[PDB]
mmCIF file of C-alpha atoms (C1' of nucleotides) in Angstrom:
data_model
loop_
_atom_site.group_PDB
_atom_site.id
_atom_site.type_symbol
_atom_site.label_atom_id
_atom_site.label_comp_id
_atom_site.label_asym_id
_atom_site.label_seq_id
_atom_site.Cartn_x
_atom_site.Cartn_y
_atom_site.Cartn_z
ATOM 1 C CA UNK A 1 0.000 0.000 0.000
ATOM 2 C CA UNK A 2 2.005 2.870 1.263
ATOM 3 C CA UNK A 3 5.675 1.097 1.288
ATOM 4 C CA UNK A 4 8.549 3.546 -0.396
ATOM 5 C CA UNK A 5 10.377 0.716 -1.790
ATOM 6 C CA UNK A 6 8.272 -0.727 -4.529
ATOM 7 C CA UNK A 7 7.149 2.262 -5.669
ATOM 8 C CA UNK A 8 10.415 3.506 -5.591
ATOM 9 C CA UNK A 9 11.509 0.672 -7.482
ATOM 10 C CA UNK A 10 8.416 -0.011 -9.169
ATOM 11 C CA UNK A 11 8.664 3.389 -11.660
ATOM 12 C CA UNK A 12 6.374 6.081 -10.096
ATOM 13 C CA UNK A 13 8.994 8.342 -8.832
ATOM 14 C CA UNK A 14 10.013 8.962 -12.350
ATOM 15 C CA UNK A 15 8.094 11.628 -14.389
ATOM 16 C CA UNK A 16 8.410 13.304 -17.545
ATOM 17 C CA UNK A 17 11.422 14.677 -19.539
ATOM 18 C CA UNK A 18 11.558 18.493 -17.788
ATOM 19 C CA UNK A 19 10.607 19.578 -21.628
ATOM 20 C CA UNK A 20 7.266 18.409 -21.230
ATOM 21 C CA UNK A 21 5.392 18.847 -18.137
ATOM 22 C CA UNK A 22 2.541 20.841 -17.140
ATOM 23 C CA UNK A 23 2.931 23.676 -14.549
ATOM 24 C CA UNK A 24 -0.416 22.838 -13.259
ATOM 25 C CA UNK A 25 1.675 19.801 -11.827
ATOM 26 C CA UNK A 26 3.975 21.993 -10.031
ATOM 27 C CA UNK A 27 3.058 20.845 -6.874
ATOM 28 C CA UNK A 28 3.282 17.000 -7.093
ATOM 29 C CA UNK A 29 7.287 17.653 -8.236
ATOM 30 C CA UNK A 30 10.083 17.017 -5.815
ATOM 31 C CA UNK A 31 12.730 19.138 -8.133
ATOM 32 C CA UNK A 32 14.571 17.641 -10.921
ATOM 33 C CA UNK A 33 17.629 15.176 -11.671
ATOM 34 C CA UNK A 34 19.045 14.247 -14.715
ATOM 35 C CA UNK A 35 16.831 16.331 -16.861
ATOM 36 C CA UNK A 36 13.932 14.811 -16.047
ATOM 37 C CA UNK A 37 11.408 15.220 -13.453
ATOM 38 C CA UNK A 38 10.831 13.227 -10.290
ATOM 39 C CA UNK A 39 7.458 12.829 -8.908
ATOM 40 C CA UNK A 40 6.837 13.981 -5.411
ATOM 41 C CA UNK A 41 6.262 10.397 -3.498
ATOM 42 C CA UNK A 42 5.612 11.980 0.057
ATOM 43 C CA UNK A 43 2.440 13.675 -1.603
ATOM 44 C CA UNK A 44 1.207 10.612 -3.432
ATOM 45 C CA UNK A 45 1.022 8.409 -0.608
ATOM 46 C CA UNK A 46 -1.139 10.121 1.080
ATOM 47 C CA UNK A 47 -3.595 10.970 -2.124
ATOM 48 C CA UNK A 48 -3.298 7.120 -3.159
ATOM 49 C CA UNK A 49 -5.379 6.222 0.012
ATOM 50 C CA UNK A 50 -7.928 8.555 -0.656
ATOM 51 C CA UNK A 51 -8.178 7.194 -3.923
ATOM 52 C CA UNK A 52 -8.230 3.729 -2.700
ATOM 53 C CA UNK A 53 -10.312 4.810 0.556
ATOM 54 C CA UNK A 54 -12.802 5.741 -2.383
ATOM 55 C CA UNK A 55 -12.752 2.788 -4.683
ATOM 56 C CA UNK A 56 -13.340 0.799 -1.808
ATOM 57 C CA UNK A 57 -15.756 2.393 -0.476
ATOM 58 C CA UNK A 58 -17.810 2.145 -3.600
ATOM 59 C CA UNK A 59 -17.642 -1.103 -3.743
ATOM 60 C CA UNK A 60 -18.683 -1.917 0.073
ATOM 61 C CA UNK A 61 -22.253 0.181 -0.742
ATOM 62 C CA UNK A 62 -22.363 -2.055 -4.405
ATOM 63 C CA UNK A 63 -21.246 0.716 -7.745
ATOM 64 C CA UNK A 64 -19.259 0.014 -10.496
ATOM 65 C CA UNK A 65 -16.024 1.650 -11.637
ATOM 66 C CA UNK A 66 -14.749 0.953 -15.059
ATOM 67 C CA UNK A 67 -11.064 0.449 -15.989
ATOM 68 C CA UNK A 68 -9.857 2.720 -18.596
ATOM 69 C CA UNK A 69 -6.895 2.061 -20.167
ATOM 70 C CA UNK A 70 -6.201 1.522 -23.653
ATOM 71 C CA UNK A 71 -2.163 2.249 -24.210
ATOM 72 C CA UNK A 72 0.351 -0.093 -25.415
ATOM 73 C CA UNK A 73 1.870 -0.242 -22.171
ATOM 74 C CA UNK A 74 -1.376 -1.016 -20.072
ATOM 75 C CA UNK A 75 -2.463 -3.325 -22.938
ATOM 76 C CA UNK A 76 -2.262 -6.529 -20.777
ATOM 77 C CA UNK A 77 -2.147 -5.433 -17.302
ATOM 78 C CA UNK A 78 -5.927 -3.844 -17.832
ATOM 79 C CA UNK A 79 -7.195 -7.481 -18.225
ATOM 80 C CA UNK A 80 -5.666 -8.529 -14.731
ATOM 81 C CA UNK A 81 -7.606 -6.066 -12.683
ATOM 82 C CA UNK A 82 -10.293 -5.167 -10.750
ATOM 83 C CA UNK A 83 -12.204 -5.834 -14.051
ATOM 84 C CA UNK A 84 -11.665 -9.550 -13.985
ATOM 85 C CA UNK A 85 -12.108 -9.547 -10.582
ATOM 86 C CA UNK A 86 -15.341 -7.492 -10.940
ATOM 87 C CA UNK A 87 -15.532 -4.795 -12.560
ATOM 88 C CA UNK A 88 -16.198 -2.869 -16.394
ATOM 89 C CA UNK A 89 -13.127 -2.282 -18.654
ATOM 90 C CA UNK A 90 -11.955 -0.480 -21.841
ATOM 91 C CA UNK A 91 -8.449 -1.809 -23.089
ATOM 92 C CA UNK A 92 -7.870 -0.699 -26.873
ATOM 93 C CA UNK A 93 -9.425 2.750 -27.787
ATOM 94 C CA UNK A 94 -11.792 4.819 -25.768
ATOM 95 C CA UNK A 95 -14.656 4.945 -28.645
ATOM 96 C CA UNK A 96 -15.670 8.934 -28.726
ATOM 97 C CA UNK A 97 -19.200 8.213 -27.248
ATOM 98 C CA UNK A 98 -19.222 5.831 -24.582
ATOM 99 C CA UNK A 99 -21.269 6.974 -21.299
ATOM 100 C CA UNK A 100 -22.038 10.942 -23.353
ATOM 101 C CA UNK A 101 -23.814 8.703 -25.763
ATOM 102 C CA UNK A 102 -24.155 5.637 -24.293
ATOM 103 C CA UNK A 103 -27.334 5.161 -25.960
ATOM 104 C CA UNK A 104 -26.124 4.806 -29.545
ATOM 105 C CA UNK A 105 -23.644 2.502 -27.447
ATOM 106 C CA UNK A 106 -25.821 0.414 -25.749
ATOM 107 C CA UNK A 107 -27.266 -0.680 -28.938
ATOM 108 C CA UNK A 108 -23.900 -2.792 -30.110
ATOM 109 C CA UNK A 109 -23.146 -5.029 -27.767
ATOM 110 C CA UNK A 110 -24.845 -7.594 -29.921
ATOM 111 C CA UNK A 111 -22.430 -8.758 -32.434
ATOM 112 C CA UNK A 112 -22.946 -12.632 -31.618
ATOM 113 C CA UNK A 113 -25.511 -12.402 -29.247
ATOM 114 C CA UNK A 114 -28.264 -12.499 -32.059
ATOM 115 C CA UNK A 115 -26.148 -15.457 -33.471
ATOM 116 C CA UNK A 116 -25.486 -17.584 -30.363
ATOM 117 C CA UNK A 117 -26.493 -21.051 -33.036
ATOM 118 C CA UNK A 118 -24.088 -20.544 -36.275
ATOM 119 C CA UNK A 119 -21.852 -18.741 -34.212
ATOM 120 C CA UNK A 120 -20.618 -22.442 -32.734
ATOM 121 C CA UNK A 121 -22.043 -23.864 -36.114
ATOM 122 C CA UNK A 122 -18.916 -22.273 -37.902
ATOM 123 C CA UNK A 123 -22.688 -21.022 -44.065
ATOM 124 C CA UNK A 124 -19.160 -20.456 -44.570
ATOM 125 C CA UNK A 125 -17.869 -17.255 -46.306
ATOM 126 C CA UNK A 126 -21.408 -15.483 -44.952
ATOM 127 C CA UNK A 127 -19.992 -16.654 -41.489
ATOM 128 C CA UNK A 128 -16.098 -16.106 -41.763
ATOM 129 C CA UNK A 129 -16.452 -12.095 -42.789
ATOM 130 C CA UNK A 130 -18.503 -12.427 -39.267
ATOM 131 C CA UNK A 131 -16.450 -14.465 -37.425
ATOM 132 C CA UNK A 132 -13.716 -12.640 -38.000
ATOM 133 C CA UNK A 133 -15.592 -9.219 -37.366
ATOM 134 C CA UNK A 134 -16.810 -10.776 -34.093
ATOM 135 C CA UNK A 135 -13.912 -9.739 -32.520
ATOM 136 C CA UNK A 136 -14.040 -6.214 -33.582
ATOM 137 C CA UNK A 137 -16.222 -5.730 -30.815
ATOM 138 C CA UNK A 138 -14.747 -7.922 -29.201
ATOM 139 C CA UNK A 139 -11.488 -6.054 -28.471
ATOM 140 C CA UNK A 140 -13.540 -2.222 -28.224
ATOM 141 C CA UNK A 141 -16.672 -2.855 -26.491
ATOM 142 C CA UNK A 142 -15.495 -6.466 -25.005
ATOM 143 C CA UNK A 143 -14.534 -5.508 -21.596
ATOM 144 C CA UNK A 144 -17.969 -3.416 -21.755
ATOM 145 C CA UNK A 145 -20.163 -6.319 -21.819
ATOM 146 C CA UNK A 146 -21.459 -6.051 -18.536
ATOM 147 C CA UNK A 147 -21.971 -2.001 -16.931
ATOM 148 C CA UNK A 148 -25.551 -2.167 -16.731
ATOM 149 C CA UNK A 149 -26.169 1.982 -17.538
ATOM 150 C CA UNK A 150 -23.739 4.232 -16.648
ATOM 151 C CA UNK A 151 -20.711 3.520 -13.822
ATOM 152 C CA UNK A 152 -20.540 6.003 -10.663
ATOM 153 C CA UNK A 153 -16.741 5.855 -11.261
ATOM 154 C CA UNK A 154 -14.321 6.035 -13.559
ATOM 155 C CA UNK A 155 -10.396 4.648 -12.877
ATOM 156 C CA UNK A 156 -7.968 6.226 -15.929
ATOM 157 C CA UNK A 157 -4.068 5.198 -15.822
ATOM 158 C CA UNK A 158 -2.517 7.861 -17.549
ATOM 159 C CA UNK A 159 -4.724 11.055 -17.941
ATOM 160 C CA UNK A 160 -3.029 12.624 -20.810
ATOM 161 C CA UNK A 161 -3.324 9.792 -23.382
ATOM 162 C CA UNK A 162 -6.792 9.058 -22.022
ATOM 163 C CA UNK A 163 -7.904 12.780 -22.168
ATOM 164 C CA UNK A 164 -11.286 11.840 -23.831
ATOM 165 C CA UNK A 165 -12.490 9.896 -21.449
ATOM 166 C CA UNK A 166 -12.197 12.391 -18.935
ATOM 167 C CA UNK A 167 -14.388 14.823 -21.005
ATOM 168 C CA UNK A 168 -17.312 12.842 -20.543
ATOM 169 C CA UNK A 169 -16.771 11.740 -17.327
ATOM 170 C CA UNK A 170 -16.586 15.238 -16.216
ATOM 171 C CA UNK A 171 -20.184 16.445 -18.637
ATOM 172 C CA UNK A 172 -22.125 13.530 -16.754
ATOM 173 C CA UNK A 173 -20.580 14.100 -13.450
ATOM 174 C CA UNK A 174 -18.976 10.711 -12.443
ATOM 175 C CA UNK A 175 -15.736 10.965 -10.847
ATOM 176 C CA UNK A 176 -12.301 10.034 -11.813
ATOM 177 C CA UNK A 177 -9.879 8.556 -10.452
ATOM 178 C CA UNK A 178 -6.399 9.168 -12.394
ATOM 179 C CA UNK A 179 -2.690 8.434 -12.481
ATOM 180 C CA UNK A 180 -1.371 11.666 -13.518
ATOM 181 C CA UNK A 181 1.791 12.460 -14.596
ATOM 182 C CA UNK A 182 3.912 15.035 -14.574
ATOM 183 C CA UNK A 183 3.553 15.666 -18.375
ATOM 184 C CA UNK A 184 -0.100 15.586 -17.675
ATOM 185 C CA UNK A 185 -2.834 17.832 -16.214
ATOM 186 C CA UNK A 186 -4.359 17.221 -12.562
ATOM 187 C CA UNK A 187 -7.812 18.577 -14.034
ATOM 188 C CA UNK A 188 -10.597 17.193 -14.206
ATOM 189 C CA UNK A 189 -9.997 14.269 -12.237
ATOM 190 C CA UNK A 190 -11.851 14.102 -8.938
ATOM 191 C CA UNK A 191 -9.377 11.788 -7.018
ATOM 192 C CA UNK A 192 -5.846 12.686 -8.597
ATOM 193 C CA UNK A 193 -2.743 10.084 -8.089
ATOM 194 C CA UNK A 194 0.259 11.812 -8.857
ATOM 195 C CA UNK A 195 2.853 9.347 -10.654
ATOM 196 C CA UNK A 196 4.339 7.653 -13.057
ATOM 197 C CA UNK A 197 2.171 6.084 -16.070
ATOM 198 C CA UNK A 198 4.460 4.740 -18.257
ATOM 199 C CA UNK A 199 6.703 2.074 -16.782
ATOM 200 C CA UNK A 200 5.000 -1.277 -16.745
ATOM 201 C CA UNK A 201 6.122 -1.673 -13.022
ATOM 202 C CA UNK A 202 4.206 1.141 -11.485
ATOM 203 C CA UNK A 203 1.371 0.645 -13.791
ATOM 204 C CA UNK A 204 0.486 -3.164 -11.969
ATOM 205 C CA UNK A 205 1.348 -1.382 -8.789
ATOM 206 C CA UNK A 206 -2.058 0.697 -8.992
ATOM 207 C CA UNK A 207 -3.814 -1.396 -11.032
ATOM 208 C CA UNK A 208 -3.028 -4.649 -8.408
ATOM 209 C CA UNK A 209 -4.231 -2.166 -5.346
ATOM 210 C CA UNK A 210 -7.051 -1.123 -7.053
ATOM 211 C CA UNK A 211 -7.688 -5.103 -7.955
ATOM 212 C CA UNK A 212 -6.940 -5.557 -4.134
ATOM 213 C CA UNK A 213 -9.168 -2.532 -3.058
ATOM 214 C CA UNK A 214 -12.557 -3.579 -4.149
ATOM 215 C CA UNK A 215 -10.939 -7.176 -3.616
ATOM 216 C CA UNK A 216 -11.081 -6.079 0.181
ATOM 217 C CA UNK A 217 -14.444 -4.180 -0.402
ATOM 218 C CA UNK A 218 -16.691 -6.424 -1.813
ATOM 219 C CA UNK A 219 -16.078 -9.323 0.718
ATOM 220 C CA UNK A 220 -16.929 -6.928 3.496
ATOM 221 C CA UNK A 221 -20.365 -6.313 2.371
ATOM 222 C "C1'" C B 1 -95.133 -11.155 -73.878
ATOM 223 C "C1'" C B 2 -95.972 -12.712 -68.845
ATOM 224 C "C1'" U B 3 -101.499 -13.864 -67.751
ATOM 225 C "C1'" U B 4 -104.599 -12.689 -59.624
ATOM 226 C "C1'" C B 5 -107.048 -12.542 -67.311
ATOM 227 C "C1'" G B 6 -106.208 -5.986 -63.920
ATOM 228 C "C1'" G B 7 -101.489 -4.411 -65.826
ATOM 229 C "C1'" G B 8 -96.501 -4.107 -67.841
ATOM 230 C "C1'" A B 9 -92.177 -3.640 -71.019
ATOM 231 C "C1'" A B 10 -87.720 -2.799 -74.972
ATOM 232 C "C1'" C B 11 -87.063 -0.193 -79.896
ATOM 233 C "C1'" U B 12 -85.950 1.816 -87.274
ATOM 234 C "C1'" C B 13 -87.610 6.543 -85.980
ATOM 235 C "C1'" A B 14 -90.355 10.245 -83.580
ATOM 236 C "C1'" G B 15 -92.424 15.597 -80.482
ATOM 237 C "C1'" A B 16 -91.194 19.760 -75.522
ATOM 238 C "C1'" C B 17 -87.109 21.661 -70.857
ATOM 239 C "C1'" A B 18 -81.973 20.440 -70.504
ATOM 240 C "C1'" C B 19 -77.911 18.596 -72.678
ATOM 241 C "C1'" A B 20 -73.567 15.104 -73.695
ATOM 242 C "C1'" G B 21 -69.273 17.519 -77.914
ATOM 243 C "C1'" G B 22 -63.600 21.477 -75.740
ATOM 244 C "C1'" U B 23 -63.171 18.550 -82.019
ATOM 245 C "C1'" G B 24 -58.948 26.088 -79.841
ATOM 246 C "C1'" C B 25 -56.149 28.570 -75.112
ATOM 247 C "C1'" U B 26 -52.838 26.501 -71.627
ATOM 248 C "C1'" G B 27 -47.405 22.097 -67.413
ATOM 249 C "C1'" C B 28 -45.572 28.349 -64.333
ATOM 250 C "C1'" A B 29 -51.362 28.265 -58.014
ATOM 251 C "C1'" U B 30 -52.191 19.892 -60.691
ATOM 252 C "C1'" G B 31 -48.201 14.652 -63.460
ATOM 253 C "C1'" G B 32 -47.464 9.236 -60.219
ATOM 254 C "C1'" C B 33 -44.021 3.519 -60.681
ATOM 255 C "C1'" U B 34 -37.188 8.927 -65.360
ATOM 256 C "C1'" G B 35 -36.886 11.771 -72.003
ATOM 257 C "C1'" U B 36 -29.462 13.530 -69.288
ATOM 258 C "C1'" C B 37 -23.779 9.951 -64.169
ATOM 259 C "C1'" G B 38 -18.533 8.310 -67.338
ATOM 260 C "C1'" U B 39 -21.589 3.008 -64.011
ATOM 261 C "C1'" C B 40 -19.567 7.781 -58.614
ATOM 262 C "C1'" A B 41 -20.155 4.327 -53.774
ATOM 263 C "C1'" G B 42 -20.868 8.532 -54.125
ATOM 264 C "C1'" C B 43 -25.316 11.679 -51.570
ATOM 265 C "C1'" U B 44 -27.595 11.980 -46.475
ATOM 266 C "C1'" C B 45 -29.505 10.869 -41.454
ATOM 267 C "C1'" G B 46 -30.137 9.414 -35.574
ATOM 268 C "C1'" U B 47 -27.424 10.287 -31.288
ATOM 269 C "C1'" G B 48 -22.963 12.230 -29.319
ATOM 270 C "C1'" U B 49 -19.082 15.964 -29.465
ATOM 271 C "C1'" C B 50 -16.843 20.723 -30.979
ATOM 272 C "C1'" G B 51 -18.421 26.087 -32.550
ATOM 273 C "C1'" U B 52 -22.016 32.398 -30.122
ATOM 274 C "C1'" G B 53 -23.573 30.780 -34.630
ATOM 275 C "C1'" A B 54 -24.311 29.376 -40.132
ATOM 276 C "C1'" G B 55 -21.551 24.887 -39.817
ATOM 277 C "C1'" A B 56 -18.371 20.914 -39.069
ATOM 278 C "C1'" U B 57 -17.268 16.045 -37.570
ATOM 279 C "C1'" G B 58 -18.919 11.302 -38.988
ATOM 280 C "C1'" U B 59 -17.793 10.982 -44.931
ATOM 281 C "C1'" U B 60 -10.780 13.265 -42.664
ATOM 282 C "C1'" G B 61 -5.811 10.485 -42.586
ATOM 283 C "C1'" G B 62 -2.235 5.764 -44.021
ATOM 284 C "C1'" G B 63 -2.798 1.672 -47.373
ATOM 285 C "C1'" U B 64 -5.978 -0.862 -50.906
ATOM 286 C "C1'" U B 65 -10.156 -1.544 -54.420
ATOM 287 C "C1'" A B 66 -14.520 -1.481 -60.374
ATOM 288 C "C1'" A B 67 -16.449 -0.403 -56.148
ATOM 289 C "C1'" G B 68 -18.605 3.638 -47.683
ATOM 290 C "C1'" U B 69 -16.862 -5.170 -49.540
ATOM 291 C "C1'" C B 70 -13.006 -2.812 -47.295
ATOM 292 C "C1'" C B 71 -8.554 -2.975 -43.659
ATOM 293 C "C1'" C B 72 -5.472 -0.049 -40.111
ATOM 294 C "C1'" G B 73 -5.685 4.499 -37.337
ATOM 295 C "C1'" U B 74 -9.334 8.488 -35.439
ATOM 296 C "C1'" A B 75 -14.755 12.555 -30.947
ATOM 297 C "C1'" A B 76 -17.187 9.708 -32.829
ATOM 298 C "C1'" C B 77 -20.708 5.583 -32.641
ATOM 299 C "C1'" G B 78 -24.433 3.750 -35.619
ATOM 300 C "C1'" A B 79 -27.458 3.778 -39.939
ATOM 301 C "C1'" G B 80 -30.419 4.567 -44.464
ATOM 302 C "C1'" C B 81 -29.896 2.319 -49.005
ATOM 303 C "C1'" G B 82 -25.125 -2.877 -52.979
ATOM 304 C "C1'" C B 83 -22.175 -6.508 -57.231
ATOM 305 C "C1'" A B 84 -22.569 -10.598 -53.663
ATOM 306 C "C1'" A B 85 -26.963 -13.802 -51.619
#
RNA sequence: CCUUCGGGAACUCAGACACAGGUGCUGCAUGGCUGUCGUCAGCUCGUGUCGUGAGAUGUUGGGUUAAGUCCCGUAACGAGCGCAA
């Protein structure tokens, strides 16, 4: 949870190239070394909790928080969540419309669904063009499959490259909670988590105690 | 020509009121299931977003194709309508 050592040797502390970096993020910075910046980790601690006193405490009174995360280098942690161990997902591209227009969204989850007898029948070149468009929305809506309206929450990994997201979010009014780094911008997101969103390392590290959080949150109630 | 043995009818033509006839005008208050695309997959829409707005995005880009069959990327996601069948 709040141990110095993994997520000091787990990325996090690392930020941005000095270059690019937001002075909105002044704060969360503990100086510079090496031309690069170094993310305060006295000040995240303490703002982790809080976002993991949140998620589980969403959890314990029954909501859903969905997993955003569609970037190369969350691409396979963001199926080992709290998704799979619960929860709604988005792993490869935040579609411009889910939860804004989640109507129009709503109405394509069925790709198989009204096909669930020549789907496992494997026609043949009606059924292959299909088949191998089932997975289409299989990789953008897939993790999607189950949300049930809207979530109350909304869990982003690295704020910048998931910007989008955050817009709508924000226009509903569901919070966010958000890894931002130092190249990013703390606004916007409700429950901020200043750190490093790049390094595979640090991005289990939130994703595992956010698994963990509604892990120990959904057994208590 | 049917017959309660009363009565009735159609027509070559035929007499009085009204008429049918537009057989001139005019596709500029009246055509519906076309008299001009080379066969362009091109023209639009619902919702969402962006803009004070008219708009725009979707429909742009990278590749590919007779060809919105496409594919990969993308504030859009769907759709109306195909050679296939």
């Amino acid at each position: 949870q709040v141990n110095m050592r993994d997520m000091l040797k787990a990325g996090v502390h690392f930020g941005h190239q000095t270059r690019y970096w937001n002075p909105k993020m002044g704060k969360f910075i503990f100086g510079a070394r090496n031309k690069i910046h170094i993310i305060n980790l006295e000040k995240t601690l303490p703002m982790f909790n809080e976002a993991l006193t949140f998620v589980e405490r969403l959890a314990a009174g029954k909501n859903k928080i969905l997993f955003v995360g569609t970037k190369r280098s969350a691409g396979k942690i963001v199926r080992e969540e709290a998704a799979r161990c619960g929860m709604p997902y988005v792993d490869h591209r935040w579609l411009g419309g889910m939860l804004t227009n989640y109507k129009t969204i709503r109405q394509s989850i069925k790709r198989l669904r009204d096909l669930e007898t020549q789907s496992q029948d494997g026609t043949k070149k009606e059924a292959l063009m299909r088949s191998r468009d089932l997975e289409k929305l299989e990789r953008s809506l897939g993790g999607i499959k189950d949300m049930g309206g809207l979530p109350d929450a909304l869990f982003v990994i690295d704020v910048d490259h998931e910007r989008i997201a955050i817009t709508e979010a924000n226009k509903l009014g569901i919070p966010v909670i958000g890894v931002v780094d130092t190249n990013s911008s703390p606004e916007g997101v409700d429950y901020v988590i200043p750190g490093n969103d790049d390094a595979i390392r640090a991005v289990q590290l939130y994703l595992n105690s956010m698994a963990e959080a509604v892990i120990r949150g959904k057994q208590g109630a």
